[PDB]
Structures are given as structure tokens and as C-alpha cells.
Amino acid sequence: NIMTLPKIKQVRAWFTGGATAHWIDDHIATPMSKYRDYESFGINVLGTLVVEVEAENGQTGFAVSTAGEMGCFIVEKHLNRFIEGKCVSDIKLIHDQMLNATLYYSGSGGLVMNTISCVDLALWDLFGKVVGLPVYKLLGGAVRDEIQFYATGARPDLAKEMGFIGGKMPTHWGPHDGDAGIRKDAAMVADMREKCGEDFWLMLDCWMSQDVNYATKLAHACAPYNLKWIEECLPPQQYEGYRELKRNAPVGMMVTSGEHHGTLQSFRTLSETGIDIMQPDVGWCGGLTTLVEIAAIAKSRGQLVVPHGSSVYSHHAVITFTNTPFSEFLMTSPDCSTMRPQFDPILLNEPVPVNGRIHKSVLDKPGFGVELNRDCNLKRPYSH
Amino acid sequence: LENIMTLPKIKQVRAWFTGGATAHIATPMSKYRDYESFGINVLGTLVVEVEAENGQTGFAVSTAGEMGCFIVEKHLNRFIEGKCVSDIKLIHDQMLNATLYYSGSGGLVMNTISCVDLALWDLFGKVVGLPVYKLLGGAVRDEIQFYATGARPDLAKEMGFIGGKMPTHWGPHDGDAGIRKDAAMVADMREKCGEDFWLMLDCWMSQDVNYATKLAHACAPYNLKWIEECLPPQQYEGYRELKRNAPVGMMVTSGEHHGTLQSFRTLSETGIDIMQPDVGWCGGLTTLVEIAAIAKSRGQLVVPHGSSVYSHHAVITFTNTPFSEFLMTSPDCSTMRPQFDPILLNEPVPVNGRIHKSVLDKPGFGVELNRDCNLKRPYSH
């Protein structure tokens, strides 16, 4: 009676862009801002990793992430031994073998975890396509008919005109800029509030570029404008810093972090610091398998989990979380004015929000519902 | 006042790799009957060489391999070249912050940053004409005393070491039998080594709190000095609980797989007795020295992982490190073979379980690169 499932025959890894191949390129505050010559620091060195898992029946599944050539090394020279020969349904098993087999060098996040994540996603894609169901249905179905999005870019006013529920702006100054920096980023928020109205959400992303005092001053300077939350003020290792910041945050204003945190255990620690919302990235936290466990601990705490925007990889997950009432969409547009697929053009048939939402019928396709665009500058650095 | 010594700028940095996938110890993978193999030798060795504008050079080695060469040749080089040979701390900070978004605060990327830091210190010392340990403020003891890591503590004792660290052979899935066997192993070594010789167990991230607690107590009757790295590095909370349940007087340690100063701050606050950073994984010498300081500020010892000359020059200057580690890379653990043999030339080894400082009295880390190894240059710039 049971549906026959094939075994996985092989896994392949390619990379595009990177070392060995606009608003975001405009004075964005980062951990490197401290340095004038980097106010450049190689934010695009990794490039994109694409992992394809082929089953013994010819069916295939894939996923993409940030890892590039080095990611292909990890996949082609190490993880393949835990992937090939497995059942297409041995997703959790492969995931655990990967985490434990690379524990000694993964550093619980970053490059190696992004790679493990990509594999996990490619396995889920394959399984769903083998079964004939969208990932969100395999996970237990949607808990809402559509996903509502806030947009990340420099123009919250334009995002509002486009139907989004909010807009997240990046900070432009850091600790070394002192009171002037705070004054300028705060004024920026004040202006957007003026232009967007009261009900449209505004958020600040600080991309690990501040310390507790600067972050505290910035949050309070923005409190008069009802900033919903202040995101990733500190490097991910500074859990203690996050606990202190949260305690000094304006009442009602939320403190969030997590896109650069990896492994379930790290999120357990992060959650205990008191921050309001953890923001794991499926492609960095360990994959879908890990993301779903992270959602659960936040829920066990009566807290929301709001994953980083990862296109279809995130959509299929968040639509099933009773714990994620909204999601994120990155405005990869130079001026932030058009709806361009996030992973364009590597992904074919990638959906985009319409009126700030994506209905579930849109996700009703096998696996993650997209196909690999093999006309990209895909490179095969290693084989096995 | 005399004229300041003129220092050259670094001209270029190059990286090679030897070993790697492109050239019954308990582990986290032990639970799988097919890996109890799991690719523990996939990375290979990374060698970084920094050349100054005057032709002088400095280098260091670590675990990163080909991928490490990618990081060095395609990213970090921009923060290294053109700098003064004395801009060590600056380069170190630029590297940490420039790779923060993908380093994961440890592992592969940190091992790479570490290797660079060490190569820079090697260069600077060789340019100045002083051993690294003198640049750091001098030795605080005349010799480094060592305990040995291998399966034969009894042989290590005969060789003059102050102790012997054995690895565990079973884990949580083996239950009471596993505990019984590893405990008996310790009991036997105690019998053969006497009372004053130290015995330690390395668990290499393979246990959970309950198993570790039972194992420590089963070994308490034999005065095990400490139980090392029982849990994965992210489990700080686990370490706090384990420490609270550890036999009184028995120490709990960890740290060889932890990276960045901030992580060590967190680790130290769990209550564990001794942190064991590895210069080649924690971030480099620059970071190791800061780690030593927070342990000292706590009135605690810091005992770095054994990293040959890279560790020696650091630990001999720490009033906080009364002893160090030497790995028995011998199949049976019976001979004194240089740890990084043969990649390192003129690498010293302990004699009577010690290495006098006069042995370290050479420029930088006092060793030279053996260019007759299977060194590969995967990338250039």
C-alpha cells in the first residue's frame, strides 16, 4: 500500500559569483564601518552555492545559499558520504550526521552551516517533488491563507505604496559617529514616520555594528516615532550584551537578532537573553530541519519567531508557523521600487509578494516549487 | 635617544595546503555504528606565509587546508598586504570584523584567521630579531612542564611527563558498560603510574550531562585530575550543570573548539575550572593572550591546547599556565616526534617532560618551513 520511495543516487555542488567567479552600496553601517577605507571589506567574496540531489529514479531536488566554491568543497569532499545511498525520506538522519560529522570545524554557524543548510533544503525539495507535495504540506499544512510581508530597503514610503505592512531601514552610522550618527539615523526614522503614517511599521537593522550604549541611545532616540524593533545591534556571540540591551530598551520597543546565529542550541541561549524575536535564516541556522525546531522553542515561550526572508525556502516554513504572523521580503532593487525575485535569476518561477502578500495557492507546487536556471554562470569546482 | 628601528611593509601573503581530501575514540559521530570514517582528516593543513618588502618572511600552519587558502588568497589578503609588519593587532581586528558575517565565531574560518595572526607574529619577531615570547614580555618560568596526550600514560611517565591524558572510548549510547570500561582504564593507569602522576580524560564533545556526570564520579576514586570537553561547545548551560555535579576537587575543562574572545568570556562564566583554547582555533596568538588574561582576572588557570612552538612561546609567558600539553603522535605513544612533523623544520620536543626557554631563543617562533612537503597553491591573487 505504501508509496515506493527511491534512494538518492548522487549530490552535486556548483557555485556562481564570488571571489573566483544602489541603496545597499550606500554608506551602510557594518562591523567594518569603523574603518574609513571600508566605510570594500569583501561582503561578496563567497558567492552562491547550489546543491542538487539526484534520486535513483532521475528525480532531483536543489537549493541555493551563500557559501560558493568552499561550499562545494564541503559538499563534494565530505557531506556526500552521508547523503548518497540514503532514502529520500532520511532527511532528519542526514541532517544530524552532517551536524555531528562537521562539529569539529563548523564553528556552529557561518560558512559551514550555510552549506549544511543548503543540503537540508535540497533534500526537502527532492522529497516533496518525489512525493508530489509542496514542502508546506509535508510540514503539516498552512495555518493561514496568505503570508503578509514587511519590506527591507531604504524606502519604507515606497514599500507602503506597494502594499507592504512595514519597512525595515538599515542604519548608516555607528558608535564611532557618536551623537551625530544617532541624530541622523533617528531623523531618518522620523521622516519615514511622517511619510508613512501611524499604522505602517518601521524597523532598523543595525547589522552587528554597534555596542550596548550606542544601541541603547539609538533605540531611545527613535522611541518617539514608535520604531517597532531594533535589529541585530551586536555581534552574535554577545548574548550577555543582548540581555543588557533588552533591559535598557524603550518599553514596548522590541529587540531582535538571529540571522547570523546557527544551530538549535545557540538559539536556546539566544532566547534566554530576553530578546523579543529571534530571526533565524533557513540558509544559515542549519536548514529547514533546524528552523522548525527554533520556531518551536519560541512558541514554547509564547514568543513570535520571524525568520529572515529567504524566498520559497522561508515561505513554505513560515506559512505553517502559527508563531510567525508576518515575514520579510528584501528589496534587491537599486532604488527599492520594483518587485524582483529575491534569488533572481538563479531561480526559475520564483514568486514575489503582490499587495504585500503571497497566497498559499502560489506555493502549491512540488517541493519548494522552483527550478534551477542552468543558464547561469554555474561552476563545478569539485567532483567525487 | 637613538633612531627607531626602521620596519618594512608586508609585500604579500601566500597560502598552501598539504593533506586533505584534495591532496576507537568516542566522538559525536560514535552513535552511528558506521562511524564509531566520518571525515576527520578532510581539511588538511593550511600554511600561510607573509613576505615583507625586504625579503624577510614569517609563516604558520594550522587546520584549514584548501578552503583556508581561499579565505586567505581571496579575502584576508586585502587587510594584510601594505601593512607594517608591526600592525599585527590591527590586521587581526580587521580580519575578525570583515569575516564576522560568515566566520561563525570559530571553526574553519577562525582557524584560518589564527594561522595568519601567527604568521604575522613570526614575521615581526624575525624582522626585529627576537623570539615571540620576548616580544610578549618575556618568560615567567625557565622551562615549560608537560603532561602528555596519548593512550599510554604509563609510558609517558617513563618519559618524564607530569601526567597523561587518555581519550574516552565509549559514549552515552554505551551506557553503564561504557562508563565501566573507561573507568577501569583509568583505574589501571593509576595502578601503573602511582599517586603523583596526573591522569585526565578527554571526551571530545561526545557526551551529554548525565553520562559525563556518571563517568566523572566513577573515576573519582582514582583521583582523575580533570574531565575534558564532555559537551559540544555551544552547550554552555550544559557545562554549568556538569560543573555543579562534578566530583568535588575534580576539574571540568573545555575550550579547544571555542573561538573568539567573547565566547571564552561566556565559557568562563559557566564555572568550568580551566579553559583550553587552541592558538590555531581560538583566533590566534593575539586572541589567546586576551583569553589568558580573563582567566587570570578570575584567579583561574588557562591551559592552552598543545600547538608546538605556537603554544610554547605563549604559555611560557603566562604566570597563569603552570604546565602545558604535548601530543603523542606516535602509533603506540613511545617516541618523541615533533608535533607538526615534517612540515616544520627544527621543531623542538620535550626532554624529560620539559622544554627550557633557551630552546625558544630564536627569531619569531624559531622554525622554518619545509618546502619539500606536498605543498599545493590552489589560489593566487
Short mmCIF file of N, CA and C in Angstrom, two decimals, chain B residues 1-155:
data_model
loop_
_atom_site.label_atom_id
_atom_site.label_comp_id
_atom_site.label_asym_id
_atom_site.label_seq_id
_atom_site.Cartn_x
_atom_site.Cartn_y
_atom_site.Cartn_z
N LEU B 1 68.30 60.24 22.47
CA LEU B 1 67.57 58.98 22.14
C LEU B 1 67.91 58.49 20.73
N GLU B 2 68.19 57.20 20.64
CA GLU B 2 68.55 56.59 19.37
C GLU B 2 67.42 56.62 18.34
N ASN B 3 67.79 56.39 17.09
CA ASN B 3 66.86 56.38 15.98
C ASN B 3 66.09 55.05 16.01
N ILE B 4 64.78 55.13 15.82
CA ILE B 4 63.94 53.95 15.85
C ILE B 4 64.28 52.96 14.73
N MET B 5 64.20 51.67 15.05
CA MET B 5 64.47 50.63 14.06
C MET B 5 63.48 50.83 12.92
N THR B 6 63.98 50.85 11.69
CA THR B 6 63.11 51.01 10.53
C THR B 6 62.46 49.67 10.20
N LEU B 7 61.14 49.67 10.05
CA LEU B 7 60.40 48.45 9.75
C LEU B 7 59.79 48.46 8.35
N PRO B 8 59.89 47.33 7.63
CA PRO B 8 59.34 47.24 6.27
C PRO B 8 57.84 46.97 6.27
N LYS B 9 57.22 47.15 5.10
CA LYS B 9 55.80 46.90 4.94
C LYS B 9 55.71 45.47 4.45
N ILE B 10 54.58 44.82 4.65
CA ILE B 10 54.48 43.46 4.18
C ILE B 10 54.15 43.58 2.70
N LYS B 11 54.85 42.79 1.89
CA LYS B 11 54.68 42.80 0.45
C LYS B 11 53.50 41.95 -0.03
N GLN B 12 53.45 40.70 0.42
CA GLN B 12 52.39 39.79 0.01
C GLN B 12 52.24 38.64 0.98
N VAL B 13 51.10 37.96 0.89
CA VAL B 13 50.81 36.81 1.72
C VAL B 13 50.40 35.66 0.81
N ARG B 14 50.98 34.48 1.01
CA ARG B 14 50.63 33.31 0.20
C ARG B 14 50.20 32.15 1.07
N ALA B 15 49.42 31.24 0.50
CA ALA B 15 48.93 30.10 1.25
C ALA B 15 48.96 28.81 0.44
N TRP B 16 49.34 27.73 1.11
CA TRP B 16 49.42 26.41 0.51
C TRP B 16 48.68 25.43 1.42
N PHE B 17 48.52 24.20 0.94
CA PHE B 17 47.86 23.17 1.73
C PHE B 17 48.46 21.81 1.41
N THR B 18 48.65 21.00 2.44
CA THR B 18 49.16 19.65 2.27
C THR B 18 48.14 18.78 3.00
N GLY B 19 47.89 17.59 2.46
CA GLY B 19 46.91 16.71 3.08
C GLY B 19 45.52 17.19 2.71
N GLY B 20 44.50 16.50 3.19
CA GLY B 20 43.15 16.92 2.86
C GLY B 20 42.54 16.05 1.78
N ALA B 21 41.25 16.23 1.54
CA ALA B 21 40.52 15.46 0.55
C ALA B 21 40.85 15.81 -0.91
N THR B 22 41.71 16.80 -1.12
CA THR B 22 42.08 17.20 -2.47
C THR B 22 43.56 17.03 -2.76
N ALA B 23 44.30 16.50 -1.79
CA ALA B 23 45.73 16.28 -1.96
C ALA B 23 45.95 14.98 -2.73
N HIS B 24 39.42 3.69 18.30
CA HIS B 24 38.07 3.51 18.82
C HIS B 24 37.74 4.66 19.79
N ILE B 25 38.09 5.87 19.37
CA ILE B 25 37.85 7.07 20.16
C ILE B 25 36.40 7.53 20.06
N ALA B 26 35.83 7.93 21.20
CA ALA B 26 34.45 8.39 21.24
C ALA B 26 34.35 9.81 20.67
N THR B 27 33.44 9.99 19.72
CA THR B 27 33.22 11.29 19.08
C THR B 27 31.71 11.51 18.95
N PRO B 28 31.30 12.70 18.48
CA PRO B 28 29.87 12.96 18.33
C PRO B 28 29.23 12.02 17.32
N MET B 29 30.06 11.45 16.44
CA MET B 29 29.58 10.52 15.43
C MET B 29 29.56 9.06 15.90
N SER B 30 30.19 8.78 17.04
CA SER B 30 30.24 7.41 17.57
C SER B 30 28.89 6.70 17.63
N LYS B 31 27.81 7.44 17.84
CA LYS B 31 26.49 6.83 17.95
C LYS B 31 26.05 6.08 16.70
N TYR B 32 26.63 6.42 15.55
CA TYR B 32 26.28 5.76 14.30
C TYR B 32 27.23 4.57 14.11
N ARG B 33 26.68 3.36 14.16
CA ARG B 33 27.51 2.16 14.02
C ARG B 33 28.41 2.11 12.79
N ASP B 34 28.28 3.08 11.90
CA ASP B 34 29.11 3.11 10.70
C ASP B 34 30.23 4.15 10.77
N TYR B 35 30.30 4.86 11.89
CA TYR B 35 31.33 5.89 12.08
C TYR B 35 31.91 5.91 13.49
N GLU B 36 31.55 4.93 14.30
CA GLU B 36 32.04 4.84 15.68
C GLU B 36 33.51 4.44 15.73
N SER B 37 36.68 7.71 8.68
CA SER B 37 35.28 7.32 8.65
C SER B 37 34.37 8.52 8.42
N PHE B 38 34.16 9.32 9.45
CA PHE B 38 33.30 10.50 9.34
C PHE B 38 34.04 11.72 8.80
N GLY B 39 35.20 11.49 8.18
CA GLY B 39 35.99 12.56 7.60
C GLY B 39 36.67 13.51 8.57
N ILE B 40 37.47 12.96 9.48
CA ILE B 40 38.18 13.78 10.46
C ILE B 40 39.45 14.40 9.86
N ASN B 41 39.84 13.93 8.67
CA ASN B 41 41.05 14.42 8.01
C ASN B 41 40.77 15.10 6.68
N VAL B 42 39.54 15.57 6.50
CA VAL B 42 39.16 16.21 5.25
C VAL B 42 39.77 17.57 4.96
N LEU B 43 40.02 18.36 6.00
CA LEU B 43 40.57 19.70 5.81
C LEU B 43 42.02 19.78 5.37
N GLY B 44 42.89 19.00 6.01
CA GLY B 44 44.29 19.06 5.65
C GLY B 44 44.93 20.26 6.33
N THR B 45 46.19 20.51 6.02
CA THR B 45 46.92 21.61 6.63
C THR B 45 47.06 22.87 5.80
N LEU B 46 46.83 24.01 6.44
CA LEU B 46 46.97 25.31 5.79
C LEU B 46 48.30 25.92 6.23
N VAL B 47 49.05 26.46 5.28
CA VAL B 47 50.31 27.13 5.58
C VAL B 47 50.24 28.53 5.00
N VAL B 48 50.42 29.53 5.85
CA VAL B 48 50.37 30.92 5.42
C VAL B 48 51.75 31.55 5.54
N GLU B 49 52.20 32.21 4.47
CA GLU B 49 53.50 32.86 4.50
C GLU B 49 53.36 34.33 4.19
N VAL B 50 53.88 35.16 5.08
CA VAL B 50 53.82 36.60 4.87
C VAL B 50 55.21 37.09 4.53
N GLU B 51 55.33 37.74 3.38
CA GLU B 51 56.61 38.26 2.93
C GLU B 51 56.65 39.77 3.06
N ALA B 52 57.73 40.27 3.65
CA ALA B 52 57.93 41.70 3.83
C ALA B 52 58.61 42.26 2.59
N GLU B 53 58.63 43.58 2.46
CA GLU B 53 59.24 44.24 1.32
C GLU B 53 60.77 44.08 1.29
N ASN B 54 61.35 43.57 2.37
CA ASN B 54 62.80 43.38 2.44
C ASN B 54 63.20 41.93 2.20
N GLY B 55 62.23 41.10 1.83
CA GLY B 55 62.53 39.70 1.58
C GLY B 55 62.34 38.80 2.78
N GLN B 56 62.33 39.36 3.99
CA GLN B 56 62.14 38.53 5.17
C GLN B 56 60.73 37.96 5.14
N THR B 57 60.55 36.79 5.74
CA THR B 57 59.24 36.15 5.75
C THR B 57 58.91 35.49 7.09
N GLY B 58 57.61 35.30 7.32
CA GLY B 58 57.13 34.65 8.52
C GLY B 58 56.01 33.73 8.08
N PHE B 59 55.80 32.63 8.80
CA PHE B 59 54.75 31.70 8.43
C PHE B 59 54.21 30.97 9.65
N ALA B 60 53.13 30.23 9.43
CA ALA B 60 52.50 29.44 10.47
C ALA B 60 51.65 28.39 9.78
N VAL B 61 51.25 27.37 10.53
CA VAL B 61 50.43 26.31 9.98
C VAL B 61 49.25 26.03 10.88
N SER B 62 48.20 25.46 10.30
CA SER B 62 47.00 25.14 11.05
C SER B 62 46.13 24.20 10.24
N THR B 63 44.94 23.92 10.77
CA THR B 63 43.98 23.05 10.11
C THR B 63 42.93 23.88 9.38
N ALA B 64 42.98 23.86 8.05
CA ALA B 64 42.04 24.60 7.22
C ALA B 64 42.14 24.11 5.78
N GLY B 65 43.37 23.84 5.35
CA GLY B 65 43.61 23.33 4.01
C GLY B 65 43.27 24.24 2.84
N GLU B 66 42.77 23.63 1.77
CA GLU B 66 42.43 24.36 0.55
C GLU B 66 41.46 25.50 0.79
N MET B 67 40.37 25.23 1.51
CA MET B 67 39.39 26.28 1.81
C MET B 67 40.06 27.43 2.54
N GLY B 68 41.01 27.11 3.41
CA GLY B 68 41.73 28.14 4.12
C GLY B 68 42.50 29.01 3.14
N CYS B 69 43.07 28.40 2.10
CA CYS B 69 43.81 29.16 1.09
C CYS B 69 42.86 30.10 0.36
N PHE B 70 41.62 29.67 0.17
CA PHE B 70 40.61 30.50 -0.49
C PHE B 70 40.39 31.77 0.34
N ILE B 71 40.12 31.59 1.62
CA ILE B 71 39.89 32.70 2.53
C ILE B 71 41.07 33.65 2.53
N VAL B 72 42.28 33.11 2.61
CA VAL B 72 43.49 33.93 2.62
C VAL B 72 43.74 34.67 1.29
N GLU B 73 43.76 33.91 0.19
CA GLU B 73 44.02 34.45 -1.14
C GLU B 73 42.91 35.30 -1.76
N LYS B 74 41.67 35.07 -1.36
CA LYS B 74 40.57 35.82 -1.96
C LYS B 74 39.90 36.85 -1.06
N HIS B 75 40.30 36.92 0.21
CA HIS B 75 39.66 37.88 1.10
C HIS B 75 40.57 38.62 2.07
N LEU B 76 41.19 37.88 2.99
CA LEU B 76 42.07 38.47 4.01
C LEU B 76 43.31 39.20 3.50
N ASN B 77 43.78 38.83 2.32
CA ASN B 77 44.98 39.44 1.75
C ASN B 77 44.87 40.95 1.66
N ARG B 78 43.67 41.45 1.39
CA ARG B 78 43.46 42.89 1.27
C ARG B 78 43.67 43.65 2.58
N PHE B 79 43.62 42.94 3.70
CA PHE B 79 43.81 43.58 5.01
C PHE B 79 45.24 43.38 5.49
N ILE B 80 45.95 42.45 4.86
CA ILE B 80 47.32 42.12 5.24
C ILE B 80 48.41 42.89 4.48
N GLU B 81 48.34 42.85 3.16
CA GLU B 81 49.35 43.49 2.33
C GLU B 81 49.38 45.02 2.43
N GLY B 82 50.59 45.57 2.46
CA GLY B 82 50.74 47.01 2.56
C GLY B 82 50.81 47.52 3.99
N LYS B 83 50.51 46.64 4.94
CA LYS B 83 50.54 46.98 6.36
C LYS B 83 51.98 46.93 6.86
N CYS B 84 52.22 47.54 8.02
CA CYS B 84 53.55 47.49 8.62
C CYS B 84 53.62 46.10 9.24
N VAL B 85 54.82 45.56 9.38
CA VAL B 85 54.97 44.24 9.97
C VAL B 85 54.55 44.27 11.44
N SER B 86 54.45 45.47 12.00
CA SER B 86 54.06 45.63 13.40
C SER B 86 52.55 45.89 13.58
N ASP B 87 51.80 45.97 12.48
CA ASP B 87 50.35 46.21 12.56
C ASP B 87 49.60 44.90 12.84
N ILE B 88 50.16 44.06 13.70
CA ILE B 88 49.54 42.77 14.00
C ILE B 88 48.13 42.84 14.57
N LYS B 89 47.93 43.65 15.62
CA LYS B 89 46.61 43.78 16.24
C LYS B 89 45.58 44.38 15.29
N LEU B 90 46.02 45.33 14.48
CA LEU B 90 45.13 45.98 13.51
C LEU B 90 44.61 44.96 12.50
N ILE B 91 45.53 44.26 11.85
CA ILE B 91 45.16 43.26 10.86
C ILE B 91 44.20 42.24 11.48
N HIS B 92 44.52 41.81 12.69
CA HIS B 92 43.72 40.83 13.41
C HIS B 92 42.28 41.30 13.58
N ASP B 93 42.10 42.55 13.97
CA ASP B 93 40.77 43.09 14.17
C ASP B 93 40.03 43.26 12.85
N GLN B 94 40.73 43.72 11.81
CA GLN B 94 40.10 43.89 10.50
C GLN B 94 39.63 42.53 9.98
N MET B 95 40.41 41.48 10.22
CA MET B 95 40.02 40.14 9.77
C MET B 95 38.77 39.64 10.51
N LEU B 96 38.75 39.79 11.83
CA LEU B 96 37.60 39.33 12.62
C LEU B 96 36.32 40.03 12.19
N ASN B 97 36.39 41.34 12.04
CA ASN B 97 35.22 42.11 11.65
C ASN B 97 34.82 41.97 10.19
N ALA B 98 35.79 41.75 9.31
CA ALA B 98 35.46 41.60 7.89
C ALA B 98 34.83 40.24 7.58
N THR B 99 35.06 39.25 8.44
CA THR B 99 34.52 37.91 8.21
C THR B 99 33.46 37.53 9.23
N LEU B 100 33.08 38.49 10.06
CA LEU B 100 32.08 38.23 11.08
C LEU B 100 30.82 37.60 10.47
N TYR B 101 30.36 38.13 9.33
CA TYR B 101 29.14 37.60 8.72
C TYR B 101 29.18 36.14 8.28
N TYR B 102 30.37 35.54 8.15
CA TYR B 102 30.42 34.15 7.73
C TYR B 102 31.38 33.25 8.51
N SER B 103 32.05 33.81 9.51
CA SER B 103 33.01 33.02 10.28
C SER B 103 32.37 32.07 11.29
N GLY B 104 31.16 32.40 11.74
CA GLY B 104 30.51 31.56 12.73
C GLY B 104 31.23 31.59 14.07
N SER B 105 32.06 32.60 14.27
CA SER B 105 32.82 32.77 15.51
C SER B 105 33.67 31.56 15.91
N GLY B 106 34.21 30.85 14.92
CA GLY B 106 35.02 29.68 15.22
C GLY B 106 35.13 28.73 14.05
N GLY B 107 35.72 27.56 14.29
CA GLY B 107 35.86 26.58 13.24
C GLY B 107 36.76 27.01 12.09
N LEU B 108 36.54 26.40 10.93
CA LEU B 108 37.31 26.65 9.71
C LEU B 108 37.81 28.07 9.48
N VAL B 109 36.90 29.04 9.45
CA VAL B 109 37.28 30.42 9.20
C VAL B 109 38.17 31.02 10.29
N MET B 110 37.95 30.62 11.54
CA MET B 110 38.75 31.15 12.65
C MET B 110 40.14 30.51 12.67
N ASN B 111 40.22 29.25 12.26
CA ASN B 111 41.50 28.55 12.20
C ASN B 111 42.38 29.28 11.20
N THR B 112 41.74 29.76 10.14
CA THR B 112 42.41 30.48 9.06
C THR B 112 42.89 31.84 9.56
N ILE B 113 42.01 32.56 10.24
CA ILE B 113 42.39 33.86 10.78
C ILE B 113 43.55 33.65 11.75
N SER B 114 43.48 32.57 12.53
CA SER B 114 44.53 32.25 13.51
C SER B 114 45.89 32.05 12.85
N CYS B 115 45.91 31.22 11.81
CA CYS B 115 47.14 30.93 11.10
C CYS B 115 47.78 32.23 10.63
N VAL B 116 46.98 33.13 10.08
CA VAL B 116 47.52 34.41 9.62
C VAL B 116 48.17 35.18 10.78
N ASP B 117 47.44 35.31 11.89
CA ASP B 117 47.94 36.02 13.07
C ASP B 117 49.30 35.47 13.48
N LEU B 118 49.41 34.15 13.56
CA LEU B 118 50.66 33.51 13.92
C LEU B 118 51.76 33.81 12.92
N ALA B 119 51.42 33.79 11.63
CA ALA B 119 52.42 34.07 10.59
C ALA B 119 52.91 35.51 10.71
N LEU B 120 52.02 36.41 11.12
CA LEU B 120 52.39 37.81 11.27
C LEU B 120 53.33 37.98 12.47
N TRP B 121 53.03 37.29 13.57
CA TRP B 121 53.89 37.36 14.74
C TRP B 121 55.25 36.75 14.41
N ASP B 122 55.26 35.67 13.63
CA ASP B 122 56.51 35.04 13.24
C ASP B 122 57.37 36.04 12.45
N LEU B 123 56.74 36.71 11.48
CA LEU B 123 57.43 37.69 10.65
C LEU B 123 58.02 38.83 11.47
N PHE B 124 57.19 39.45 12.30
CA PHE B 124 57.60 40.56 13.14
C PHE B 124 58.78 40.18 14.03
N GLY B 125 58.68 39.04 14.69
CA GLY B 125 59.77 38.60 15.54
C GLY B 125 61.05 38.41 14.75
N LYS B 126 60.94 37.82 13.57
CA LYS B 126 62.11 37.58 12.72
C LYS B 126 62.66 38.87 12.14
N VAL B 127 61.81 39.88 11.99
CA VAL B 127 62.26 41.17 11.47
C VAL B 127 63.02 41.90 12.58
N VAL B 128 62.47 41.86 13.79
CA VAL B 128 63.08 42.51 14.94
C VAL B 128 64.31 41.76 15.44
N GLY B 129 64.30 40.44 15.32
CA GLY B 129 65.42 39.64 15.77
C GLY B 129 65.17 39.05 17.15
N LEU B 130 63.90 38.95 17.55
CA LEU B 130 63.56 38.41 18.86
C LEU B 130 62.54 37.27 18.82
N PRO B 131 62.59 36.39 19.83
CA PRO B 131 61.63 35.28 19.86
C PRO B 131 60.29 35.91 20.24
N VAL B 132 59.18 35.31 19.83
CA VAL B 132 57.87 35.85 20.18
C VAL B 132 57.69 36.00 21.69
N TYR B 133 58.14 35.01 22.46
CA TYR B 133 57.99 35.05 23.91
C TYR B 133 58.66 36.26 24.56
N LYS B 134 59.66 36.83 23.90
CA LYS B 134 60.32 38.02 24.44
C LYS B 134 59.50 39.26 24.06
N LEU B 135 58.91 39.25 22.86
CA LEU B 135 58.09 40.38 22.42
C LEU B 135 56.87 40.52 23.35
N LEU B 136 56.36 39.38 23.81
CA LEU B 136 55.20 39.34 24.70
C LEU B 136 55.47 39.79 26.13
N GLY B 137 56.74 39.98 26.48
CA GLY B 137 57.05 40.40 27.83
C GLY B 137 57.94 39.43 28.59
N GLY B 138 58.50 38.46 27.87
CA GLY B 138 59.40 37.50 28.50
C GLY B 138 58.78 36.32 29.22
N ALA B 139 59.62 35.33 29.49
CA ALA B 139 59.20 34.13 30.19
C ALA B 139 58.98 34.41 31.67
N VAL B 140 58.06 33.67 32.29
CA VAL B 140 57.79 33.84 33.71
C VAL B 140 58.22 32.58 34.45
N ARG B 141 58.92 31.72 33.72
CA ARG B 141 59.45 30.47 34.26
C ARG B 141 60.58 30.05 33.32
N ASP B 142 61.54 29.29 33.83
CA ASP B 142 62.67 28.88 32.99
C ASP B 142 62.37 27.74 32.03
N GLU B 143 61.37 26.94 32.35
CA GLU B 143 61.02 25.82 31.49
C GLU B 143 59.52 25.55 31.51
N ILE B 144 59.03 24.91 30.46
CA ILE B 144 57.62 24.55 30.38
C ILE B 144 57.54 23.08 30.78
N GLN B 145 56.66 22.75 31.71
CA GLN B 145 56.47 21.36 32.13
C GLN B 145 55.28 20.82 31.34
N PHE B 146 55.38 19.59 30.86
CA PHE B 146 54.32 18.99 30.05
C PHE B 146 53.70 17.71 30.57
N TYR B 147 52.41 17.53 30.27
CA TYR B 147 51.70 16.29 30.57
C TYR B 147 51.54 15.81 29.13
N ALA B 148 51.40 14.51 28.90
CA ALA B 148 51.30 14.01 27.54
C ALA B 148 49.94 13.45 27.17
N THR B 149 49.54 13.65 25.91
CA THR B 149 48.25 13.16 25.45
C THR B 149 48.45 11.96 24.54
N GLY B 150 47.92 10.82 25.00
CA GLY B 150 48.03 9.58 24.26
C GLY B 150 47.37 8.45 25.05
N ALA B 151 47.38 7.25 24.48
CA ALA B 151 46.76 6.09 25.12
C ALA B 151 47.59 5.41 26.21
N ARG B 152 48.87 5.77 26.33
CA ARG B 152 49.75 5.15 27.32
C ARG B 152 50.36 6.07 28.38
N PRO B 153 49.57 6.48 29.38
CA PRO B 153 50.09 7.36 30.44
C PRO B 153 51.30 6.74 31.16
N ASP B 154 51.32 5.41 31.26
CA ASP B 154 52.43 4.73 31.92
C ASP B 154 53.74 4.94 31.17
N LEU B 155 53.68 4.95 29.85
CA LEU B 155 54.87 5.16 29.04
C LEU B 155 55.28 6.63 29.12
#
